[PDB]
Design an enzyme around this catalytic site. Structure first.
Site, PDB file in Angstrom:
ATOM      1  N   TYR A 170       0.849  -1.196   0.000  1.00  0.00           N
ATOM      2  CA  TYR A 170       0.000   0.000   0.000  1.00  0.00           C
ATOM      3  C   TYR A 170       0.880   1.240   0.000  1.00  0.00           C
ATOM      4  O   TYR A 170       1.582   1.521   0.983  1.00  0.00           O
ATOM      5  CB  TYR A 170      -0.947   0.048   1.203  1.00  0.00           C
ATOM      6  CG  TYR A 170      -1.984  -1.049   1.195  1.00  0.00           C
ATOM      7  CD1 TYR A 170      -2.219  -1.815   0.048  1.00  0.00           C
ATOM      8  CD2 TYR A 170      -2.731  -1.320   2.332  1.00  0.00           C
ATOM      9  CE1 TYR A 170      -3.176  -2.832   0.047  1.00  0.00           C
ATOM     10  CE2 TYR A 170      -3.679  -2.333   2.345  1.00  0.00           C
ATOM     11  CZ  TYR A 170      -3.898  -3.083   1.209  1.00  0.00           C
ATOM     12  OH  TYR A 170      -4.846  -4.078   1.243  1.00  0.00           O
TER      13      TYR A 170
ATOM     14  N   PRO B  49     -17.453  -4.220   1.486  1.00  0.00           N
ATOM     15  CA  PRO B  49     -18.736  -4.367   2.212  1.00  0.00           C
ATOM     16  C   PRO B  49     -19.923  -3.781   1.468  1.00  0.00           C
ATOM     17  O   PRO B  49     -21.018  -4.329   1.483  1.00  0.00           O
ATOM     18  CB  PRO B  49     -18.493  -3.605   3.527  1.00  0.00           C
ATOM     19  CG  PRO B  49     -17.302  -2.744   3.277  1.00  0.00           C
ATOM     20  CD  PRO B  49     -16.460  -3.507   2.308  1.00  0.00           C
ATOM     21  N   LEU B  50     -19.670  -2.643   0.837  1.00  0.00           N
ATOM     22  CA  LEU B  50     -20.586  -2.002  -0.085  1.00  0.00           C
ATOM     23  C   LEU B  50     -19.927  -1.954  -1.426  1.00  0.00           C
ATOM     24  O   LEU B  50     -18.881  -1.353  -1.562  1.00  0.00           O
ATOM     25  CB  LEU B  50     -20.915  -0.564   0.298  1.00  0.00           C
ATOM     26  CG  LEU B  50     -21.623  -0.150   1.567  1.00  0.00           C
ATOM     27  CD1 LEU B  50     -21.763   1.357   1.562  1.00  0.00           C
ATOM     28  CD2 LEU B  50     -22.990  -0.770   1.632  1.00  0.00           C
TER      29      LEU B  50
ATOM     30  N   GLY C 205     -20.213  -3.104  -6.033  1.00  0.00           N
ATOM     31  CA  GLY C 205     -20.684  -3.949  -7.101  1.00  0.00           C
ATOM     32  C   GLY C 205     -22.175  -4.157  -6.932  1.00  0.00           C
ATOM     33  O   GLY C 205     -22.688  -5.228  -7.232  1.00  0.00           O
ATOM     34  N   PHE C 206     -22.865  -3.132  -6.425  1.00  0.00           N
ATOM     35  CA  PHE C 206     -24.310  -3.190  -6.229  1.00  0.00           C
ATOM     36  C   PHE C 206     -25.049  -2.607  -7.429  1.00  0.00           C
ATOM     37  O   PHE C 206     -24.707  -1.526  -7.922  1.00  0.00           O
ATOM     38  CB  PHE C 206     -24.739  -2.433  -4.965  1.00  0.00           C
ATOM     39  CG  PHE C 206     -24.484  -3.172  -3.690  1.00  0.00           C
ATOM     40  CD1 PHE C 206     -23.213  -3.343  -3.223  1.00  0.00           C
ATOM     41  CD2 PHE C 206     -25.528  -3.661  -2.939  1.00  0.00           C
ATOM     42  CE1 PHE C 206     -22.972  -4.013  -2.042  1.00  0.00           C
ATOM     43  CE2 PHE C 206     -25.297  -4.315  -1.760  1.00  0.00           C
ATOM     44  CZ  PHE C 206     -24.000  -4.489  -1.314  1.00  0.00           C
TER      45      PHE C 206
ATOM     46  N   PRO D  25     -28.473  -0.895  -9.140  1.00  0.00           N
ATOM     47  CA  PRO D  25     -29.370   0.125  -8.588  1.00  0.00           C
ATOM     48  C   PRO D  25     -30.463  -0.471  -7.703  1.00  0.00           C
ATOM     49  O   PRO D  25     -30.770   0.114  -6.674  1.00  0.00           O
ATOM     50  CB  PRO D  25     -29.967   0.796  -9.837  1.00  0.00           C
ATOM     51  CG  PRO D  25     -29.614  -0.082 -10.982  1.00  0.00           C
ATOM     52  CD  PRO D  25     -28.348  -0.787 -10.603  1.00  0.00           C
TER      53      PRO D  25
END
Ligand SMILES: NC(=O)c1ccc[n+]([C@@H]2O[C@H](COP(=O)([O-])OP(=O)(O)OC[C@H]3O[C@@H](n4cnc5c(N)ncnc54)[C@H](OP(=O)(O)O)[C@@H]3O)[C@@H](O)[C@H]2O)c1
Ligand SMILES: Cc1ncc(CO)c(CO)c1O
Ligand SMILES: [Mg+2]
Length: 286
Positions: free
Chosen positions: A60, A212-213, A215-216, A218
Site C-alpha cells: 500500500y 462491504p458495499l 458492485g451493487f 441500482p
C-alpha cells in the site's frame, strides 16, 4: 449481539469491528495520503474506539501506509493485531504485479518488519493471484506457502493466512501450514463464499470480507438504502451489521480516511437487525 463481538485470530482476541488501512495512501493506493495528519488521527481514534485489528500491506503506497501506522501508533499495545499481506508489488505506474518468487516474499516480510517497526509479524496473508481475471482461481499455491512457512519457522511470522483463494486452495494450504484466516471478496450482494464461511467457522478459522458495499446494482443499492432509512442508519452501517451477524468468525476491516466515517462504522455494532429486516437483506443477492 447473538454472536459475540470478539473472535480469536491466531492466539489473540480481536474485536470483530476492525480497521482496514488501505485508504491511508494516495489515489490508486499509491503515494502519500492527501493529509498525513488526518491519517494519524484516524488511526489513533480507531484504537480509542476499541479497534484492535488493523489490516495493512507494505505494497500500500508502497511503504508509506505502514510508516504512517508506525508514526501514529508505535509502540503498539500487546492487545493490537496488525495483519499484513504479501504476494504482490507495485510498478512505478502504480500497477499491481505478482511477486511470488522466494526472494520477493522474503523481501516483503522484511519490508513489513522495518516499516512497521516490528521484530515478528502477527499474521501474514498470502495474497494469491492465479489467472488473468481478478478474483480467486485454481492453481497450486504450495511454492509460495512453503516460503511463508519457512519464515514462520524462523520466527519472523507468527501466523499465516490466505487472501483471494478458492476452497481447494484453502484445503491444499492447510496441508502445508496452519491457516488462521481467509480474506476474500464478499458482501451482501456477492455471496459465492457462503458455504466456505460456514465451514471455516466450524474449524475456528476467521473470514475477512472485503468490499462491504459495492458492485451493487441500482435495485440492490435501493433496497439497502430503504432498509437503512427504516432503521435510522447508514447503508454502510447496515452492510457492516449484516456481515457481523452473518457468521461469528467474520472480521470486519472497513477502511476510511475520515474520522466521521470511522465513528459511524464503529457505531454499526449498536445496530440490531430483526428477522424481518434480515429476510429483506438475505434476499438482496437473489
Ligand atoms: N486482500 C485484498 O486483495 C484486499 C482488497 C481490497 C481491500 N482489502 C482490505 O480490506 C479493507 C476494506 O476495503 P474494501 O475493498 O473492503 O472497501 P472499504 O475499505 O470498506 O471501502 C472504501 C471506501 O469506502 C468509503 N467509506 C468507508 N466508510 C464509509 C462510510 N461510513 N460512509 C461513506 N463512505 C465510507 C471510503 O471513503 P472515505 O475514506 O471518504 O471514508 C472509501 O472510499 C481495506 O482497507 C484493505 O485493508 C484487501
Ligand atoms: C486492485 C488490487 N489488486 C490487487 C490487490 C491485492 O493483490 C488489491 C488489494 O490488496 C487491489 O486493490
Ligand atoms: Mg478500504
Amino acid at each position: 449481539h447473538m454472536s459475540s463481538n470478539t473472535f480469536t485470530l491466531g492466539t489473540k482476541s480481536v474485536n470483530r469491528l476492525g480497521y482496514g488501512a488501505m485508504q491511508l495512501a494516495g489515489p490508486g493506493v499509491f503515494g502519500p495520503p492527501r493529509d498525513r495528519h488526518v491519517a494519524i488521527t484516524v488511526l489513533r481514534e480507531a484504537l480509542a474506539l476499541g479497534v484492535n485489528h488493523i489490516d495493512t500491506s507494505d505494497f500500500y503506497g508502497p511503504h508509506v501506509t505502514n510508516q504512517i501506522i508506525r508514526e501514529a501508533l508505535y509502540p503498539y499495545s500487546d492487545d493490537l493485531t496488525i495483519v499484513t499481506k504479501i504476494g504482490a508489488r507495485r510498478g512505478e505506474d502504480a500497477s499491481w504485479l505478482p511477486a511470488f518468487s522466494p526472494a520477493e516474499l522474503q523481501k516483503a516480510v522484511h519490508d513489513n518488519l522495518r516499516n512497521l517497526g516490528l521484530d515478528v509479524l502477527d499474521v501474514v496473508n498470502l495474497r494469491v493471484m492465479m489467472g488473468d481475471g481478478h478474483g480467486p482461481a485454481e492453481g497450486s499455491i504450495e511454492a509460495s506457502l512453503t516460503v511463508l512457512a519457512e519464515m514462520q519457522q524462523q520466527g519472523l511470522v507468527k501466523h499465516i493466512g490466505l487472501s483471494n483463494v478458492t476452497p481447494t486452495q484453502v484445503a491444499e494450504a492447510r496441508k502445508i501450514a496452519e491457516i488462521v484466516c481467509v480474506q476474500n471478496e464478499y458482501n451482501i450482494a456477492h455471496r459465492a463464499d457462503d458455504a466456505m464461511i460456514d465451514a471455516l467457522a466450524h474449524d475456528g478459522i476467521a473470514y475477512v470480507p472485503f468490499f462491504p458495499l459495492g458492485g451493487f446494482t441500482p435495485l440492490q443499492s435501493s433496497t439497502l438504502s430503504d432498509v437503512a432509512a427504516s432503521l435510522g442508519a447508514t447503508p454502510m452501517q447496515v452492510a457492516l451489521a449484516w456481515l457481523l451477524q452473518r457468521s461469528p468468525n467474520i472480521l470486519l476491516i472497513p477502511g476510511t480516511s475520515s474520522v466521521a466515517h470511522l465513528r459511524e462504522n464503529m457505531a454499526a455494532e449498536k445496530l440490531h437487525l430483526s428477522e424481518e429486516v434480515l429476510s429483506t437483506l438475505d434476499g438482496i443477492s437473489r
